Structure formats: structure tokens, C-alpha cells
Amino acid sequence: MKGDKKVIQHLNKILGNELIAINQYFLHSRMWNDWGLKRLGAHEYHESIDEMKHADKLIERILFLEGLPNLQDLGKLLIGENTQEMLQCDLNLELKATKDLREAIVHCEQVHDYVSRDLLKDILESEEEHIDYLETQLGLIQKVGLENYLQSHMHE
Amino acid sequence: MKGDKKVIQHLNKILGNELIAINQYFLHSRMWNDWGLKRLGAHEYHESIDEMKHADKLIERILFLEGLPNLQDLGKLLIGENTQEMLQCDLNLELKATKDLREAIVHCEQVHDYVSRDLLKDILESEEEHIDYLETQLGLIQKVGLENYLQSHMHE
Amino acid sequence: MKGDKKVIQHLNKILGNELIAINQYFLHSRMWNDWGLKRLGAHEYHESIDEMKHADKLIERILFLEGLPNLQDLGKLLIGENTQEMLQCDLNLELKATKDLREAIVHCEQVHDYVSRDLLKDILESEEEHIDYLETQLGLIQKVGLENYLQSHMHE
Amino acid sequence: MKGDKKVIQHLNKILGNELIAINQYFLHSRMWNDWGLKRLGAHEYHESIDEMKHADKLIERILFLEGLPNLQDLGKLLIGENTQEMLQCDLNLELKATKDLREAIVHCEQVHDYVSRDLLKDILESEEEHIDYLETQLGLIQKVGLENYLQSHMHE
Amino acid sequence: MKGDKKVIQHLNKILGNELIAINQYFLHSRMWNDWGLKRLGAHEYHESIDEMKHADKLIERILFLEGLPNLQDLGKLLIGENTQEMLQCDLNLELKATKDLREAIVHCEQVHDYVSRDLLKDILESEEEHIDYLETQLGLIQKVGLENYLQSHMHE
Amino acid sequence: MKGDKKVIQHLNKILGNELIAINQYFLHSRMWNDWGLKRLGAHEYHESIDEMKHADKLIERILFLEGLPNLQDLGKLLIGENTQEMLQCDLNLELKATKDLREAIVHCEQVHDYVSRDLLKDILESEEEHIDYLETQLGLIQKVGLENYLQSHMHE
Amino acid sequence: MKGDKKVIQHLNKILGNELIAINQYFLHSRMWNDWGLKRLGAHEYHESIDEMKHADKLIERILFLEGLPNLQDLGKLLIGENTQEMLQCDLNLELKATKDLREAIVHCEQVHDYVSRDLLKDILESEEEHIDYLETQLGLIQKVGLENYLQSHMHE
Ligand code: HEM
Ligand code: HEM
Ligand code: HEM
Ligand code: HEM
Ligand SMILES: O=C1NC(=O)c2c(NCCCc3ccc(O)cc3)cccc21
Ligand SMILES: O=C1NC(=O)c2c(NCCCc3ccc(O)cc3)cccc21
Ligand SMILES: O=C1NC(=O)c2c(NCCCc3ccc(O)cc3)cccc21
Numbered sequence A, B, C, D, E, F, G: 001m002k003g004d005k006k007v008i009q010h011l012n013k014i015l016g017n018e019l020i021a022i023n024q025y026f027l028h029s030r031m032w033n034d035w036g037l038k039r040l041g042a043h044e045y046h047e048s049i050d051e052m053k054h055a056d057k058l059i060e061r062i063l064f065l066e067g068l069p070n071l072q073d074l075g076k077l078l079i080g081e082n083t084q085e086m087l088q089c090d091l092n093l094e095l096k097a098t099k100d101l102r103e104a105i106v107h108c109e110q111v112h113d114y115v116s117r118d119l120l121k122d123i124l125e126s127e128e129e130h131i132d133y134l135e136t137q138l139g140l141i142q143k144v145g146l147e148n149y150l151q152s153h154m155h156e
């Protein structure tokens, strides 16, 4: 089905953000596992998987709309060097992701691609849940202290 | 069955206390969940549900006694700004609630409304159990320190 | 995640309508039960529980958006004196509620809070279902007569 | 298999009657559901389904006989404005349907299309059963009163 | 509940489209079955059933909004004479359907009938899925040859 | 029970046709199996068995009516030497069979042997189902090509 | 455990190859699904998953050896425009992958990193199995013809 050219550009921009997030979360997960913080490693693994699923749906929608999904261009991974930085890196990425999602939804609504809008809204719900998780973790570090916070994430 | 007018006023006063507690504990619960202190959130949710069940019984008794249950007047919520304050606000409310229950039981006894007394004794038992929980948490904070206490209430 | 201040105002306005509905429906339920109209009492109980669940989700959303959920202000309960009046009082409340829901969705859309919009849309679907129920009950009173209508709501 | 051209015309006439009945009974069903007369709505739904199944079998037979099933022409729906009228409308349609079934069977017998006759006979058995149901409902309205009759059809 | 007059007109237009599709898909299904292409026949039968379910929901929504669902007016069925034509006929119908759905969604959004919009969005998702299927089948005919394509659709 | 002599002659004529078909279909089945076309072989085996069952019922009816079932005279088998010809031979035999069935039914009707007619109508329904199958297979050979049609009938 | 710097460089080069393969196979998979070639799509999906699992093990090994896994640099994807090209693009990539694996194993052996060698050997066995699959599909295209080959990959 011949999609709107600018919808497809937006879907490819969101896809680009998801591909960054896949790799950043996967690397953060395996860093945390290497460090023995297995609960963080597993949670971050599931965040990466969830972004893989979003990327899949975007790829599928783009192809249906007769566009070319862009899996070649990979933007800048934000990799932290300790737990606090890694969480804040994930949050910085998520805040750019939701900004782009909102702009993509505006455009889909304007050209009446209501099915693309619905897909993007579901992804935005998932990204807002991730922002909640991240904000909560950074707040817990302040409330229980870093040493306790890390302790609570050793065992899965 | 036509009840004693002052009994009914007492029941509506206890009902008003329970209505404050429902909302205060529900809000405290959801604040704790938002902060990632999910064990406190869950426990405080169950406290709110328990007050809802008490309010239901009081409403049912007032209507049986041919009074009008007052669900319109809502007194002042005592909302804390951190875990310690929130627990102490709950305890302050409970000590007012138990005082009012004792005075209501006295009057039920005097006019021989023994069934209303038994209902209020059962509610009083639940409220004393809540006082026990609250005093215990405040003591644990002193014993284990706030950071550990909060750590212990992150996970259900 | 810092929400739009006027969105939060609207969410608190919706929450306030839900808090009225919780108490109005609960009281109506318990009145119908006291009168032996247990099918109406049970259905109205489930309507109250549904509004409790909506209020919960609104509280959770307001807190996520870093606002303060208002559980203190309780608007006017519309309590009926017989079955026809109680149903019409519920319907009057619901119509006010959907009006406020629609105006809140308009503003969510305008500021691109698409997740808040989706939550309100879901609540609106539940409120329209309640309107359907109420309009149907009122029409059935006219079709079968009040005595038959009440007969048919004695037993669960 | 090359069918008799006039058998096929008869089968298309019967199909045309079933297509009217499908839509008429489906609309009547959904009206009764909307009004809260859910027992009527469910029964009328099953009548519409039963007509759908007859139409399928007729379509299949026409194609086997190398005719063209006519799903394009839709005759006049007989829609009531209240329960008594809707039942009479169904009965009026059913009396027309059995008249046409009888004439189609006559012709099948004359040209020795005994298998089409057997199909039409089965449909006629179903349509007479619907007449029995309809005559019975109209008779019950007289015996129990319209208000009682409607009351008995509120709940499934 | 009193719905918007033009919303109801849009909903009747969509319903009118679904009524055409039900009959077109059902006939195409039974033609394919008659020809021994039973996998196409079965798939097309499920397409017709899906349209029936959409029509049901539209009728229910129109009646709730106090409109009259129009099951009398049946537009032009697009019937093919071979498999390629039948698939293209279905696709031509679906493209008219999605244009009308998008225009209906615009109007629901403008009068704030967000529940009707959500229903139409769900139907639109189903229609785009059908378009995907149709475009894919037409493409497969080119990639594998017509004879192979039909061979692969003989057996369910 | 003393049957009509000409009915019994008609029943023996139908029996004779069934006896031809048993052997023709059984040989065709075993030819197809020998050629590796096992799906045709299995389907044709089941056609032969069904004919065996009809012959059994005809034998039983003739004896009940105090006639002598003729199993001695075997008419001409129509044996094909390739798939398309075998199917055509089965179809040719079936078209002779249904012509005889219709004339037999006419006579049963005339002399009021309604039970014999019902038996013959059932047999006729089975033979028209075989005609449907055969016409469909011949149609498929044209639509998918002989080589594909055969390919699709190698395996069960 | 401090690893050999040149081993880690080899592991990151293999990881780079796996990352190209993840995205190339995933895009090819979803292209094939879009075209209705679901068997190819599912198989290619499983190939992508397998490369993801290899990349995971490489990331984990690099981190254990105190290196930095490179998920930032994504090499050139080889995307085909039809089935034949897509298979050949996969084969061209795999043949570069096995050349790099062999050179990395040589270096692991020389520096006595026998565990990294064993990992790479296991990955090589997987890549040789992928080469077998690809060479086999290309051979089948010649043996059965492209139309049949694609037909055989329509359905799962
Ligand atoms: C375009 C990029 C990618 C896409 C679209 C993608 C997609 C997927 C999908 C759809 C799944 C299955 C999820 C499920 O249903 O449970 C999955 C699983 C997985 N992915 Fe990815 N992925 C990508 C990149 C990666 C990368 C770069 C890695 C590792 C460095 C990776 C590691 C994994 C792992 C370990 C699994 C679990 C497989 C299993 O054990 O079953 N993925 N991926
Ligand atoms: C007049 C005030 C209220 C009354 C009398 C009341 C009563 C009840 C009762 C009897 C139950 C069922 C408990 C059980 O047996 O498990 C219940 C459940 C519940 N209530 Fe309330 N309630 C009130 C106010 C509220 C408020 C203000 C909220 C939230 C803001 C709320 C949220 C809930 C929730 C979430 C549930 C559980 C529902 C479920 O998932 O099953 N209630 N309430
Ligand atoms: C040519 C006209 C139609 C034909 C031949 C037809 C045929 C059928 C058939 C064969 C079934 C399956 C019944 C069973 O065995 O359970 C069915 C189901 C159904 N039909 Fe129709 N139908 C037609 C029109 C309609 C219309 C106009 C509507 C609604 C306005 C409708 C609504 C339904 C529904 C709701 C179902 C059941 C779906 C489910 O399984 O949930 N049909 N139809
Ligand atoms: C007078 C002619 C025949 C009659 C009335 C007849 C009747 C029957 C009947 C009633 C059955 C049981 C069917 C069932 O209920 O499943 C049967 C089975 C069978 N018939 Fe015949 N048959 C006749 C001739 C033949 C011939 C000529 C052959 C082969 C050359 C044959 C081969 C078979 C086979 C293989 C079975 C399956 C037996 C088993 O494995 O259980 N029949 N027949
Ligand atoms: O919070 C409230 N509790 C109440 O009862 C109430 C109202 N009552 C109207 C009379 C309801 C009534 C009538 C007959 C009967 O037998 C029992 C009760 C009105 C506004 C607010 C409230
Ligand atoms: O009904 C009410 N809703 C409220 O939020 C409230 C009050 N809030 C004090 C601050 C509560 C707070 C503080 C920090 C935070 O991160 C989130 C929340 C006080 C009285 C009555 C109400
Ligand atoms: O309602 C309708 N029934 C029909 O058959 C039809 C049309 N037929 C085109 C020929 C379709 C055809 C071709 C070959 C075949 O073997 C069987 C059928 C066209 C418009 C509307 C209708």
C-alpha cells in the first residue's frame, strides 16, 4: 500500500532510535552482568528485547507502506561507565526518543495515517514506561544510597 | 429497624474518619509505588482496602438503622512528604480514629445497641492492628536506619 | 516525567468526577441492597468499583507526571430518593463526566500528551458503557412498568 | 452440473428472501439488545444466523447448477418500531417466504430436481418452525400482557 | 445517547461499505470453493465473517447514538470472473473502504466522538490487513505463476 | 412386503449401475495407486466403497419387497487410461446413473412407494456430490495445468 | 581476566561481522514475509536470531577479557532486490565471515587463548551450516526452477 513519503521518513527516524537503544541497552545489560549486578543485567536485557520488538513492527509497517527500512545507519550509543551514568544515558536516549515519537504522531495524524499513529502511540506507551523505570531507579539511588541500591540488584 | 439517633451520629462520625483514611492511605500507597517502594505501596494499598471494607459495614449498619450515611463530608487528609512523615501522618489519624471508636462504643453500650457495639469493637481491633504496624515501622527506621528501611521496601 | 500543567489540571478534574461517582454509586448500591433490590445493588456496586479503578489509574498518571493528585476536594453527591431518581442522578453525573473527559482529551492532543489521551479515551469508553446501561434501565421502566422493573431486580 | 434455468431462478428468489430476512432479523436483534430486551435480541440473532446458513446452502447449490447467485438485489426490509410490530413484521416476511418455497418445490418436482427439492424442503421446515415461534410470541403477548411479555425477555 | 447527526451518516456509509464487502467476499468464497480452490475459498469466507463482525459493531454503535442503521441500501458488488479479477475487485473495494474510514475518523475527531473514532480505527486496521493480504496474493501470482498460485490454493 | 413389480425393476436397474461403478472406481483407484498418484487412489477407493454401500441398501430393499436382486448382469465398465480420461469416464457413468435415478423416482412417486423414493433420493444426493467432485477435478486440471494437478495428487 | 589485545581485536572484528548479519538477515526475513514467502521469511528470521546469539557470546567474552565490545560501528549491509540476489548476498557475507573466523582462531591458538578459540570454532560450525543451507537453496533454484522454488516457500 503506497504510504505517505514523510510518514515513512518518520518511521525510519523512530526505527533509527530503536536501533541505537537495542545496542545501548544490550551492552549495558552485559556490562551489568559482567559486574555481577544480575538483576540490572536481566532487566536491561528485557529492555533491549522490547526495543527489538518495536524495531520489528516498524520494519514491517515500512515495508507494507512500500518504503525501505533503514537498518544501515546507526547513531551514537550513549554508554555509561558506572551504574548511575548508564541509567542516565538510557534516560537521555528515551527523552530524545519520545520527542521524535510525538513529532511522528503529529505528522501521521495530519496525513490521516491512523494505523501508523496507533503503532507509534503503543511504542510511546512503552517508552514512557521505560522513563518511569529509569526515573524511579535514579530516585531510589538517592533514597537508599548507591551501595544498597547496587546490593539490591546483585541477585536476579 | 429504627436506631438510636446518637448511635447513628456516632456511626457517621466513624464513617467520616474511615473515609479520610481510605483516601490518605490510597494516596500514600500510590506515592510509594511511584517512588519504587513497592512493598510499602502494596501494604498501604491493603490498609486502604481494609478501611473501605469498614466503611461499607458502617454504611450498611446506618441504613439498616434507618439513618442516612454521610459520604459527602470529607475531613482533612494528612499527607506526608517522605516515608517517615507519611507513616507518622497515618499514625496520627489512627489515634484520632481509636479515640472516636471508644466514645462510640460507650454510647452504644448505654443505649443497649449491642450489635453496633460489636461492629465497632471489630473495627477497633483492626485499627489497633494498624497502630501496631505503624509503631513497628517507625521503630524499625530507628533500628536499621532509613536507607536500609527503604531498601527493604523496594521489592514485594 | 514533567507533565503539562493544564493536562494535570484536567486529570485532577476527571479524578474529582470519579471520586464523586465512587461515593454516589456506592451509596446507591447499598440503598438498593437495603431495600431488597439486590440485582440493582450488585450492578451499582460494580459501577462504583469500576470508578475506583479509573481513579487509581488517574492518580498513578498524575504522580508519574509529577503533579499532586487531589483526593481532598469532593464535589456534590447526586443522591436519589427512589429507583427512578437514583438512575437519573447517575445519568446526570455521567453526562457531566463525559463532557469533562472530552475537553481533557482535546487538551492532551494539543500538547501531544498522547498517552494521557489514550488513558482518558479508555475511561470514556467505560463511561459511555455506563450511560448505555442507565438509558436502557430508564427505558425499560417505561416498557415493562416500574413494578415489573423492580420485581426483575430483586434477585441476583 | 447444468441445472434447469427456472429452478435456478426459483433458488435465486428464495435466496433473495433469505437475504432480506438476514438483515431484518439482525437489525431487529440489535434493536432489542439496545432496548435491554436481551432474550429477544439473542433469539432474533440466532434467527438471523439460521437464515445466513440457508443462504449459504442456496448459493452453493446455485453454483453447482452453474447459475449465478444474486446477492446484489435486496428487497424491502419490514422493520417494526416496537416489539409487537417487529414480531408481526417477521411473521409477514415468513409467510411470504413459505409461499415462495412451496412454489419452488413444485417446480423442482416437475423437472425432477429432487436434490434441490430436498434442500428447499429442509429450509421450509426451518421457516415453519420460525412461524410457530412468532405466532406463539404474539399469542403470549395476549395471554400474559405486553408488560409481562417484555419483562420476561429482559434477561438471558 | 444522542450522537452527532453527521457521525451517524458517516457510520452508515462505512456500514454500507461493509455490507457490500460481506456479500462480495461471501460470493467470491463460494465461487472458489465451487472451483476446488478451497484454500482461497476458506480465507475469503473468513474475510466475509470479519466484515460481518465489523457491520455488527457499527449497527450497535449507530443504535446507541440513537440513529437508524441502514441495512436497506446495498451498493454495487464487484464480482470477478477469475481469481486474478476477484482479488483485484476485493482490493478496489478495500481502497474505497479505507478512504471512507479516514474521512469518518476526521469527523469523529472534530465533534469529539472519540469512542466512534476508536472503533473506526480498529476497523481500519482490519481493512489494511486485508489490503496487505490482497496485494501479497497479487504479487505472488507474478512471482510463482498463475498455475502454481492456484495449485497452492487447492487444498486447505 | 409385496412391492410393485416395475419399482423392483427400477431398483435392479439402479443396482446394476452401482455394480458397474463399484468395479470401475475400484480399478481406477488401484491404477492411480500403482502410478504413484496416491491421493487420487485413496479418494477413488472411497467412492467405490460408497457405491458398495448403496448397492447393499438396494439389495436389502429389493429383498424386503420380495424381489430378486440381480448381481449377475454386469454392464460395461468405462475404464480410462490416463487421469483426465478416468475422471471423464466416472463423470459419464454418473450422468447415466442420475438419469436412471430420476426416472426410478418418478415411478416410485406414481405408485406411492415413498420409502423406495426416499432411498433413491439419498443415493441421488450422493451421486450429485460425486459429480460435483468430478466436475471440480476436471476444472482444476484446466486451471492449474495437468502436471501440477497430478503433482498435487501424489501424496496423501 | 586480562585478555590478549590482538585476540580482543579479532573478537570485535567477528562481532562486527555478526552485527552486519543480524540486520541483513532480519531485513531479508521481513522482505520475504512482506512478499508472502513466509517459509523463507521464518527461516531467515531464525538465521538472524542465531547471529544475535553469537553476538551475545562475543560481547560476553570481550567483557570478561576486559575489552570494550564494539556495537557502534556497523559495516555495509548486502541487501538483495529479489530472492536469488538476497540468498547470494547472504552467501557472500558468510564467506567473508568464515575467512575472518579462521584468521581469529589462528591467532587465539598462537597466544594459547584456547577458550576463545573454542567459542570461535562453535560459531564457525554455525556459519558453515548457514553456508550449506544457502548453497543448497541456490542449487534447488536451478533444479526445480525459480517459480517452483518460490512456490515451495509461500507457506510455513
Ligand atoms: C535490527 C536489530 C535487531 C532486531 C530487529 C532484533 C529482533 C529480535 C527479535 C524480534 C527477537 C525475538 C524477541 C522475542 O519475541 O522474544 C530477538 C531476540 C534476541 N535478540 Fe535481537 N534484534 C536485533 C538486534 C540484536 C542485537 C544487536 C543483539 C545482541 C548483541 C540481539 C540479541 C538478541 C537475543 C540474545 C535474543 C534472544 C534470542 C533467544 O534466545 O531466543 N538482538 N531479537
Ligand atoms: C466511599 C468510599 C469507598 C468505598 C466504600 C470503597 C469500597 C470498596 C470495596 C468494598 C472494595 C472491595 C474490597 C474487597 O472486598 O476486596 C473496594 C475495592 C477497591 N477500591 Fe474502593 N472504596 C472507596 C473508595 C475508593 C477510592 C477513593 C479508591 C481509589 C482512589 C478506591 C480504590 C479501590 C480499588 C483499586 C479497589 C480494588 C478493585 C479491584 O481491582 O477489584 N476505593 N472498594
Ligand atoms: C449474504 C449475506 C450473509 C451470509 C451468506 C452470511 C453467512 C454467514 C455464515 C455462514 C455464518 C456462520 C454461522 C455459523 O455457522 O455459526 C455467519 C456468521 C455471522 N454473521 Fe453472517 N452472513 C451474511 C450477512 C450478515 C450480515 C449482513 C451481518 C450483520 C449485519 C452478519 C453477521 C454475522 C455474525 C455476527 C456472525 C457470527 C460471527 C462470529 O462467529 O462471531 N452476517 N454469517
Ligand atoms: C456386490 C458388489 C459389492 C458389494 C455389495 C460390496 C459391499 C461392501 C461393503 C458393504 C463394505 C463395507 C463398507 C463399510 O461399511 O466400510 C465393503 C468393503 C470393501 N469392499 Fe466391497 N462390495 C462389493 C464389491 C467389491 C469389489 C468388487 C471389491 C474389490 C475388487 C471390493 C473391495 C472392498 C474392500 C477392499 C473393502 C474394505 C474391506 C475392509 O478392509 O474392511 N468390494 N464392500
Ligand atoms: O452523603 C449522603 N448520604 C445521604 O443519605 C445523602 C442524601 N440523601 C438523600 C435521601 C436518600 C434516601 C432516601 C430514602 C431512604 O430510605 C434512604 C436514603 C443526599 C445527599 C447526600 C447524601
Ligand atoms: O489530596 C491531596 N493530594 C495531594 O497530593 C495532597 C497533599 N500533598 C502534599 C505533598 C505530597 C507529595 C510530596 C512529594 C511528592 O514527590 C509527591 C507528593 C497534601 C494534602 C492533601 C493532598
Ligand atoms: O450478485 C451477483 N451474482 C453474480 O454472479 C454477479 C456477477 N457475476 C459476474 C460473473 C462471475 C462468474 C464467472 C464465472 C463463474 O463460473 C461464476 C461466476 C456480477 C455482479 C453481481 C453478481
Ligand SMILES: O=C1NC(=O)c2c(NCCCc3ccc(O)cc3)cccc21
Binding pocket: D027, D031, D077, D078, D079, D080, D081, D082, E068, E069, E070, E071, E072, E073
Ligand atoms: O435499514 C433500515 N434501518 C432502519 O432503521 C429501517 C427502518 N426503521 C424503522 C424505525 C425503527 C426504530 C424505531 C424505534 C427505535 O428506537 C429505533 C428504530 C425502516 C426500514 C428500513 C430500515
Ligand SMILES: O=C1NC(=O)c2c(NCCCc3ccc(O)cc3)cccc21
Binding pocket: F068, F069, F070, F071, F072, F073
Ligand atoms: O444375481 C442374482 N440375484 C438372484 O436373486 C439370483 C438367483 N435367484 C435364485 C433364487 C434365490 C432366492 C430364493 C428365495 C428368496 O426368498 C430370495 C431369493 C439365481 C441366480 C442369480 C441371481
Ligand SMILES: O=C1NC(=O)c2c(NCCCc3ccc(O)cc3)cccc21
Binding pocket: A027, A031, A077, A079, A080, A081, A082, G068, G069, G070, G071, G072, G073
Ligand atoms: O560500542 C561501544 N562499546 C563500548 O564499550 C563503548 C563505549 N565504552 C564506554 C566505556 C564503558 C565501560 C566502563 C567500564 C568497564 O569496566 C567496561 C566498560 C563508548 C561508546 C561506544 C561503545
Ligand SMILES: O=C1NC(=O)c2c(NCCCc3ccc(O)cc3)cccc21
Binding pocket: A068, A069, A070, A071, A072, A073, G027, G031, G077, G078, G079, G080, G081, G082
Ligand atoms: O538498510 C537498508 N534497508 C534497505 O531497504 C536497504 C537496501 N535496499 C535495496 C532494495 C531492497 C528492496 C528491493 C525490492 C523491494 O520491493 C523492497 C526492497 C540496500 C542497502 C541497505 C538497506
Ligand SMILES: [Fe+2]
Binding pocket: A148, A151, B148, B151
Ligand atoms: Fe543493606
